[PDB]
Amino acid sequence: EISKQRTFAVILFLIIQCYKIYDLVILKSGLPLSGLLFKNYRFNFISKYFIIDSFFLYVLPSFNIPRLTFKPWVVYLQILAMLLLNIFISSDHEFVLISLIMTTWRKLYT
């Protein structure tokens, strides 16, 4: 029943929060927990993008979209535009900036 499904989801959440309160009592008593997962930056990248790419590719069929038909003027283009324009501008600016607003100073000091 929908009543029992809701109750089971709330019980499973309460079990997770009870385990969190236990690990918190360990944390506040100064006892060793073991990080989050691992200290290898590469495994962190692989696991982070495994979750993100898998979630995107798993949910993408659920939209049932076969569907490349926008009304006259609709998205993605705007995001690309302003955003990258700004990016490039900033980059060039920064480059020139460093070039004549730092390097020169260093030379003078020397």
Q: Looking at the domain assignment, is residue 39 inside a domain? A: no
Start-to-end CA distance of the chain, whole Å, equals 79
Query: Which domain covers residue 99, as residue numbers?
Result: 71-110
Tokens of 103: 């390097």
Q: Looking at the domain assignment, is residue 13 inside a domain? A: no
| Chain mean position to CA 52 | 8
Question: What's the rounded Cα separation, in Å, for the pair 2 and 8?
Answer: 10
Residue 35 identity (one-letter amino acid): G
Question: What's the rounded Cα separation, in Å, for the pair 108 and 106?
Answer: 5
Q: Looking at the domain assignment, is residue 101 inside a domain? A: yes
The data reach a resolution, in angstroms, of: 7.0
Q: Looking at the domain assignment, is residue 102 inside a domain? A: yes
Whether the CB-CB separation of 33 and 39 falls below 8 Å is answered with: no
Q: Mapping DSSP to helix (H, G, I), strand (E, B) and coil, where does residue 61 land?
A: helix
Number of neighbouring beta carbons within 10 Å of residue 44: 13
Q: Looking at the domain assignment, is residue 6 inside a domain? A: no
Q: Mapping DSSP to helix (H, G, I), strand (E, B) and coil, where does residue 66 land?
A: coil
Whether the CB-CB separation of 63 and 56 falls below 8 Å is answered with: no
Q: Looking at the domain assignment, is residue 76 inside a domain? A: yes
Whether the CB-CB separation of 47 and 37 falls below 8 Å is answered with: yes
Q: Looking at the domain assignment, is residue 88 inside a domain? A: yes
Domain count for the chain, please give it. Answer: 1
